[PDB]
Design a binder for this molecule. Structure first.
Ligand SMILES: [Mg+2]
Ligand SMILES: [Mg+2]
Ligand SMILES: [Mg+2]
Ligand SMILES: [Mg+2]
Ligand SMILES: [Mg+2]
Ligand SMILES: [Mg+2]
Ligand SMILES: [Mg+2]
Ligand SMILES: [Mg+2]
Ligand SMILES: [Mg+2]
Ligand SMILES: [Mg+2]
Ligand SMILES: [Mg+2]
Ligand SMILES: [Mg+2]
Ligand SMILES: [Mg+2]
Ligand SMILES: [Mg+2]
Ligand SMILES: [Mg+2]
Ligand SMILES: [Mg+2]
Lengths: 56, 190, 176, 199, 138
RNA sequence: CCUCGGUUGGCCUCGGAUAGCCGGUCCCCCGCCGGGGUCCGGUGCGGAGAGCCCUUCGUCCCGGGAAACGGGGCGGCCGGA
RNA sequence: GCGACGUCGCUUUUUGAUCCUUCGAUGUCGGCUCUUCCUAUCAUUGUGAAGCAGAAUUCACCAAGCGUUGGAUUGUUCAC
RNA sequence: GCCUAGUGGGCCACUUUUGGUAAGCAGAACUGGCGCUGCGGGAUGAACCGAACGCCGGGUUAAGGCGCCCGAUGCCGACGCUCAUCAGACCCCAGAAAAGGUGUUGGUUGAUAUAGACAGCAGGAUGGUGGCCAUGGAAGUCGGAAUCCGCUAAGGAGUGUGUAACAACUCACCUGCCGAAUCAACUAGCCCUGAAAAUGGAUGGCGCUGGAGCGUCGGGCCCAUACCCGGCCGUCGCUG
RNA sequence: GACGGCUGGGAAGGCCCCGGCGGGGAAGGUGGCCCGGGGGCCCCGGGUGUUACAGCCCCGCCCCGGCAGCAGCAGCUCGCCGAAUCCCGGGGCCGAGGGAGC
């Protein structure tokens, strides 16, 4: 089996609104520059970034 | 489960001319003709064999409540066949304890006049279903004979007599008087 | 899993991450019936986490591929051994189906369980699906099609296209 | 301009939904033979549904309370009205576009009646499910003109058979006329056969 | 009395779906509402096809219930269903519907004039037969 | 002359069944031409609403087809709650 | 016909619990009068079951159509 | 860094949680809401779901839906289940349980089956034995202790009606027709019983049963002030 | 409308037992043979059995057999795609700005 390399680029789209967001999730989203619904950013993937996406 | 096919065939005698217009069955014998309709069931009625020897009933793609209506049609057509060949004779007996039940038959055997059922002055008038002959049997003291070709009219008329001679406001296990269906046979034996 | 559309069967092979203790971990193969490979890999981690002490973080997936049917033109009988949770209790079942594809058989099983038992796809675990010959079937709704000269009509042909005129003169024929 | 619908064999709500949409889209609708409308479910169930309708009245003044019409025409009319927005001017005009009848009255007995296969009993019900008759339900709840409607309907049907036998005589005369003139219409029949209007 | 039965070898006419307007041979039945069909001469691949979209025809091939596409084509081209289907009134009133669909405006004008004549030539002789009935009924 | 407006060719009609229908037919059997058994066709309804009817730019010459029993229009009889 | 030891409910014709509405005011007990509604039916209609022989009485079903009184004592509801 | 208004009655929800039989009850934690806030959806609605708002045009969506009210399935949508003489119909949420059903559908376990079953229709039910013990007598035929044999296809020292005790009759058991499945115990879906309140009545209504119901799913479509594009206004920033 | 990539370097399938020569097998059992009855030799039943007067499944290469073709001309047997991707056409809404110079 050839296992491909784990991907290093992710495109993240915020799909919920700005209403009723818990403050940890809201903080990670503004650190991800996703402050509107349907805003998109490219995120490079490592353990620190994947654990933030895991929060949100 | 939808069973793909339930069929049952009925053998038809030489004495009987049978016909079908869709899901009505027209049975012809020595004693007359019987029509019964079956459009409430949605089956296939096939009339197979030349000289019309077997009547076959099919139910395609039926659940249990639709499969149960195949043998019902076959038993109804069989009862019509024995109605036109041998007839139906329901022999009722009039059980009394102290007051003899006096039965008078009127209008060719189409009305029953029941008197002195438990010493009542009320006279019960039971009109027969059309085509059912009603008769007091000879060589037997308290008996009455119903004769016809439709079993569902002969037995309904017997039920009408039976539920007309009913005891009220007493214990019916002690007050056993009434006119009850005792024998179920044919008019003409074989 | 939400059993969306036609399921697809996936060979998903996974293993642990090679620690200095276990230099090469054993490899585990599972057939997952899933809408797509992302859901297939998630159900693989569900089942492997239930069977072994292996997680997605401690493990990896070395292969995930759709396994095509070798005879999608041949009518086969399928035996599916089932584990599901009702509202009270968990039950083992065995069910039998008839299809051309084992993925079609499993999605037929999922909709059939949803119909007959009000059970959703998250509460249903496939354990084994095997193509069974016609002699070894136990279900009469499958066994009634085991006839070489099979013959049935289509009795009460309901009128589809109920709105092609929506206002016609002639009442329809349902006998054909 | 008028959509005349034979009410026989139709289901009440399905026909009333389609009629309500047509009178909202601005088409005058006449539904004839409303005693022939069928209602799904067993007759005792439907009878107790209309009996529960009858039990409702204004407790202080039933003459102001809900009017339980007994004719099948007016019952079907009430179902279409409940399917219409009848408390606005568009709703009232939609209702006024709709005529309902018992039997087939003399404006519409010399007229072809339309049928809606999406509302028919034979299409819309499984053959083993038991249905009810609007005329029988209506009569048993208080409609008085069931028997006289039946007598006028057999009076209409026996004249409709006369019209039908004459129409059949005309059409067999039409067929003998085609085989008579198939020499001088053969050069015009081929046009209608090549463009698919005949065979 | 049913005449059209789903059986191995019945030609069915596909009413809707992607293979509408075509003829298939019923090769096997799978369950209550689906059959493995195969049209090897009408360009339909062997596939599961539901019963509600096929319409049964009065043509029955003889092949086994698991025989492959070439034996199906052997039976089809031995029975010549491509011409016997065309000889029926069913395919003729399909192609008449197709021709009335393909009518152009000049076609509709020529149809209107030819029908305008044919109806009047029939209509005079209809009344001629009617009064030839009344003059000979007395 | 005001005013209310909508509309932009008609369908002049079996009863109905839906595990069945439709149309012809006599050598029949019953009735006051109507009904049924027989036979012949039709049935993804083509004696088809996936339909039918009408179909219009107008006038002038001459010819062919179709019509002549016709086209247009004043005196009588039937047809309807 | 009952039914212990246990257990599941219903109802708001009991008293509680709570304090949501009303303190720029919703007239606070009884009885008299009068109308209507409910059924968990005492009687009457139709019924089934009894350790229902008859009579009487129980238990149950459809059932609220029609009835369910005159008085002594007490302000009484209740009670007798 | 200064000055500083208003506030210092709160309430609701997931999860945790104390008192209380419980409560639209009283009291805490965490976070989010409502208050302070319109909008699409939940028929209706302080708090639920979606989403937060300048004035507009086009497009698209979310959550919800698409028989008619009422925009949208008028798809030739898929596979089943289900009949209710009290059907069912969508978070909050607006009404039900234990128990029960040869209603109907599935599944589990075990037998009893072509070394031919299960009904159903008939036939045999034997001698030892009419058993010691009790009881007047009980002889398989009130009771308790005995529960073996053989000719066997079979028959228990007998499952029941028998009689003062018997005689009789009946059952198991074993054979004839018969020709493909059958019996039992459970379990889970829908439906039904359980299930009774007062003005007339509420899946929102009409109504719906080849669903317009329930479960699992597919295409398509509908539109919010949400998102994109564009206009216009203002504000802020670029200490432009 | 056209092109291409990948996969199990697609899976199945198509043509030349109609792939050749062998070896078997069993059934949702084809011919035959036997039984049974229903017609005017035929059909439907029940039994037996292994190719015959149908078929199915398991040197299979006798160069992955040899050819087509290939995520397939319907405008459908099952995908993910596009630096391994482009062309063409139609419908709707809008025209903000106003000294850019050469
Ligand atoms: Mg939210
Ligand atoms: Mg008494
Ligand atoms: Mg006040
Ligand atoms: Mg006041
Ligand atoms: Mg007041
Ligand atoms: Mg009661
Ligand atoms: Mg609190
Ligand atoms: Mg408080
Ligand atoms: Mg405040
Ligand atoms: Mg705020
Ligand atoms: Mg808000
Ligand atoms: Mg609501
Ligand atoms: Mg949420
Ligand atoms: Mg907009
Ligand atoms: Mg809505
Ligand atoms: Mg903008």
């Amino acid at each position: 089996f050839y296992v491909p390399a784990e991907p290093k680029l992710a495109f993240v789209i915020r799909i919920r609104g700005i209403n009723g967001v818990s403050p940890k999730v809201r903080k990670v989203l503004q650190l991800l520059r996703l402050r509107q619904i349907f805003n998109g950013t490219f995120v490079k993937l490592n353990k620190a970034s994947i654990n933030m996406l895991r929060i949100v | 489960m939808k069973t793909i096919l339930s069929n049952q065939t009925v053998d038809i005698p030489e004495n009987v001319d049978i016909s079908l217009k869709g899901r009505t069955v027209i049975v012809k014998g020595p004693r007359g003709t019987l029509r019964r309709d079956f459009n409430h069931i949605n089956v296939e009625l096939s009339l197979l064999g030349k000289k019309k020897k077997r009547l076959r009933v099919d139910k395609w793609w039926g659940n249990r409540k639709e499969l149960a209506t195949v043998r019902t049609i076959c038993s109804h057509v069989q009862n019509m066949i024995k109605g036109v060949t041998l007839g139906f004779r329901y022999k009722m007996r009039s059980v009394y304890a102290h007051f003899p039940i006096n039965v008078v038959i009127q209008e060719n055997g189409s009305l029953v006049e029941i008197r002195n059922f438990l010493g009542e002055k009320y006279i019960r008038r039971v009109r027969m279903r059309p085509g059912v002959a009603c008769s007091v049997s000879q060589a037997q003291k308290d008996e009455l004979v119903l004769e016809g070709n439709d079993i569902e009219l002969v037995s309904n008329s017997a039920a009408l007599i039976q539920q007309a001679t009913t005891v009220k406001n007493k214990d019916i296990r002690k007050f056993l008087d009434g006119i009850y269906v005792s024998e179920k046979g044919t008019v003409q034996q074989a | 899993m939400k059993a969306s559309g036609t399921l697809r069967e996936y060979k998903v092979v996974g293993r642990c991450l090679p620690t200095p203790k276990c230099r090469t971990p054993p490899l585990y193969r599972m057939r997952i019936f899933a809408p797509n490979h992302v859901v297939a890999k998630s159900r693989f981690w569900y089942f492997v986490s239930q069977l072994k002490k292996m997680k997605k973080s401690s493990g990896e997936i070395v292969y995930c591929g759709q396994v095509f049917e070798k005879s999608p033109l041949r009518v086969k009988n399928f035996g599916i051994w089932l584990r599901y949770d009702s509202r009270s209790g968990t039950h083992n079942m065995y069910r039998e189906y008839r299809d051309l594809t084992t993925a079609g058989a499993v999605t037929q099983c999922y909709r059939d369980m949803g119909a007959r038992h009000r059970a959703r796809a998250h509460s249903i675990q496939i354990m084994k699906v095997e193509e069974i010959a016609a002699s070894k079937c136990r279900r009469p709704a499958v066994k009634q099609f085991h006839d070489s000269k099979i013959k049935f009509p289509l009795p009460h042909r309901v009128l589809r296209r109920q709105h092609k005129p929506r206002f016609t003169t002639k009442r329809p024929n349902t006998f054909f | 301009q008028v959509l005349v619908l034979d009410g026989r064999g139709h289901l009440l709500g399905r026909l009333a939904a389609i009629v309500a949409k047509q009178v909202l889209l601005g088409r005058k609708v006449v539904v004839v033979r409303c005693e022939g409308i069928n209602i799904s479910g067993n007759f005792y169930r439907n009878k107790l549904k209309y009996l529960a309708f009858l039990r409702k009245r204004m407790n202080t003044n039933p003459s102001r309370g809900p009017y339980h019409f007994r004719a099948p025409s007016r019952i079907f009319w009430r179902t279409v009205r409940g399917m219409l927005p009848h408390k606005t001017k568009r709703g009232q005009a939609a209702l006024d576009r709709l005529k309902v009848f018992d039997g087939i009255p003399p404006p519409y007995d010399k007229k072809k009646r339309m049928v809606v296969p999406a509302a028919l009993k034979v299409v819309r019900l499984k053959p083993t499910r038991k249905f009810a008759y609007l005329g029988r339900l209506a009569h048993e709840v208080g409609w008085k003109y069931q028997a006289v409607t039946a007598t006028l309907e057999e009076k209409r049907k026996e004249k409709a058979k006369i019209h039908y036998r004459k129409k059949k005589q005309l059409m067999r005369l039409r067929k003998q006329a085609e085989k008579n003139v198939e020499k001088k219409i053969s050069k015009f029949t081929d046009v209608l056969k090549t463009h698919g209007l005949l065979v | 009395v049913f005449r059209r039965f789903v059986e191995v070898g019945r030609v069915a006419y596909v009413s809707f779906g992607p293979h509408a307007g075509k003829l298939v041979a019923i090769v096997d039945v799978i369950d209550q509402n689906r059959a493995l069909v195969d049209g090897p001469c009408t360009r339909v691949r062997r596939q599961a096809m539901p019963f509600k979209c096929m319409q049964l025809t009065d043509f029955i091939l003889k092949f086994p219930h698991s025989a492959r596409q070439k034996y199906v084509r052997k039976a089809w081209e031995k029975a010549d269903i491509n011409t016997k289907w065309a000889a029926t009134r069913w395919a003729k009133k399909i192609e008449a519907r197709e021709r009335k669909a393909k009518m152009t405006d000049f076609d509709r004008y020529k149809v209107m004039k030819a029908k305008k004549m044919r109806n009047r030539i029939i209509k005079n002789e209809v009344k001629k037969l009617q009064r030839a009935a009344l003059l000979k009924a007395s």
